[PDB]
Design a protein around this ligand. Structure first.
Ligand SMILES: Cc1cc2nc3c(=O)[nH]c(=O)nc-3n(C[C@H](O)[C@H](O)[C@H](O)COP(=O)(O)O)c2cc1C
Ligand SMILES: CCCCCCCCO[C@@H]1O[C@H](CO)[C@@H](O)[C@H](O)[C@H]1O
Ligand SMILES: CCCCCCCCO[C@@H]1O[C@H](CO)[C@@H](O)[C@H](O)[C@H]1O
Length: 364
């Protein structure tokens, strides 16, 4: 764990250690209005011994939402709710980035004001469910809907919505933003060949499949500065329905394109739930040459694997998702080899403080 507990520079920030709390949707936002709240602020501040916190995905508009009760970042009240979170986190000494979210086709009309979802094309995500509010206190799981293909004008609108969400995040006191371009969501529906059937300049070729990503990142950078923009990618997982035919090429190229934008970090989502594909070391080393900023990986890491990835020159920082849910003091536990609590799946989403803020710190 020695390297894991070394500080690191992230743009204009000095971070305490190499541990990241990656984005973790908890569906705790206040209703009506999908507003970040007190319980969330406590939750994040409890975990502020991380080097970096990346918020749960936060939708950039009403039609960007995938799941019931996720917090938005487009209304004034939503910005203010996030400010209570960022104030709490900053009082503990920690950096926090907002994960800007558009789910594209991975939603249900019930979550987007009855609208049909949008995507690169009209392809439904196969074997994918989201959850909706059905009036009960627990999430109601449902099949996703068939999307409509985005027009030119839809692309302009979404870019504008991302751009403004970045400014909103700065107004909310975040230190930066993370673009969610991973886990089968909207941008990923353009990147991955088998999700993109477009015949215009946003599909077919590799350069066209990366164009939406390029244009969104350019707008984010223009709005808030490259030193405040990270991006998340998922080259090899396919759980939410996006498959690329030549992911080593596509994602090495994406990494090099993002390097050209000088984004402050690149975050690789190596596992999604129990989708844990073989991610060759040779590929990881290629990504490390293609993108020369701070490289973050998350997915089934433990202390040993995290330290090894850093010492082998594969990663600069490591995210721990599920362990951070149940271990607010995860860094201290990793450093000392204290046993980790395990999380309760039934309280991951929805509800209140139970299973959110009531996991204790370690006590022998
Ligand atoms: C409850 C839960 C919610 C998640 N929500 C998001 C999210 O909002 N955005 C995202 O990019 N990843 C999300 N993820 C994925 C995690 O960031 C992480 O990449 C994944 O859980 C693998 O890391 P782990 O094996 O350490 O948990 C979620 C994971 C879990 C368990
Ligand atoms: C610095 C010491 C003062 C601590 C301020 C504590 C703020 C807690 O705030 C409380 O959080 C609860 C959720 O846990 C909500 O249900 C309450 O409405 C909210 O007032
Ligand atoms: C409205 C938001 C109020 C946030 C108050 C800070 C919440 C985190 O409080 C932290 O909780 C840890 C237990 O997990 C304690 O061990 C730390 O001492 C405590 O400061």
């Amino acid at each position: 764990x020695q390297s894991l507990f070394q500080p690191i520079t992230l743009g204009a920030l000095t971070l305490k250690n190499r541990i990241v709390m990656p984005p973790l949707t908890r569906s705790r936002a206040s209703q009506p209005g999908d507003v970040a709240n007190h319980m969330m602020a406590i939750y994040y501040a409890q975990r502020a011994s991380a080097g970096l916190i990346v918020s749960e995905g936060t939708q950039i508009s009403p039609t960007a939402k995938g799941y019931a009760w996720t917090p938005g970042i487009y209304t004034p009240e939503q910005i203010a709710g996030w400010r209570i979170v960022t104030e709490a986190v900053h009082a503990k000494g920690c950096a926090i980035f907002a994960q800007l979210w558009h789910v594209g086709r991975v939603t249900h009309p019930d979550n987007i004001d009855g609208q049909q979802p949008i995507s690169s094309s009209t392809l439904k995500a196969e074997n994918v469910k989201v959850f909706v509010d059905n009036g009960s206190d627990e999430p109601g799981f449902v099949d996703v809907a068939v999307p409509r293909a985005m027009t030119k004008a839809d692309i302009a609108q979404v870019i504008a919505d991302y751009r403004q969400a970045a400014l909103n995040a700065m107004e909310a006191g975040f230190d930066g933003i993370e673009l969610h371009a991973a886990n089968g969501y909207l941008i990923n529906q353009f990147i991955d060949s088998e999700a993109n059937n477009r015949s215009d300049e946003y599909g077919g070729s590799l350069e066209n499949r990366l164009r939406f990503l390029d244009e969104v990142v350019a707008a984010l950078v223009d709005a808030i500065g490259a030193e405040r923009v990270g991006v998340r990618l998922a080259p090899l997982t396919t759980l939410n329905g996006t498959v690329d035919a030549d992911p080593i090429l596509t994602y090495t190229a994406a990494a090099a394109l993002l390097n050209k934008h000088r984004i402050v970090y690149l975050h690789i989502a190596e596992v999604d739930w129990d989708d844990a594909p073989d991610t060759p070391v040779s590929f990881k080393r290629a990504l490390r040459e293609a993108y020369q900023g701070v490289l973050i990986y998350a997915g089934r890491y433990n202390a040993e694997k995290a330290e090894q990835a850093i010492n082998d020159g594969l990663a600069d920082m490591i995210g721990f998702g599920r362990p951070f849910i149940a271990n607010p003091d995860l860094p201290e536990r990793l450093r000392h080899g204290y046993p980790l609590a395990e999380h309760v799946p039934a309280t991951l989403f929805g509800g209140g403080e139970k299973g959110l803020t009531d996991y204790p710190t370690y006590q022998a």
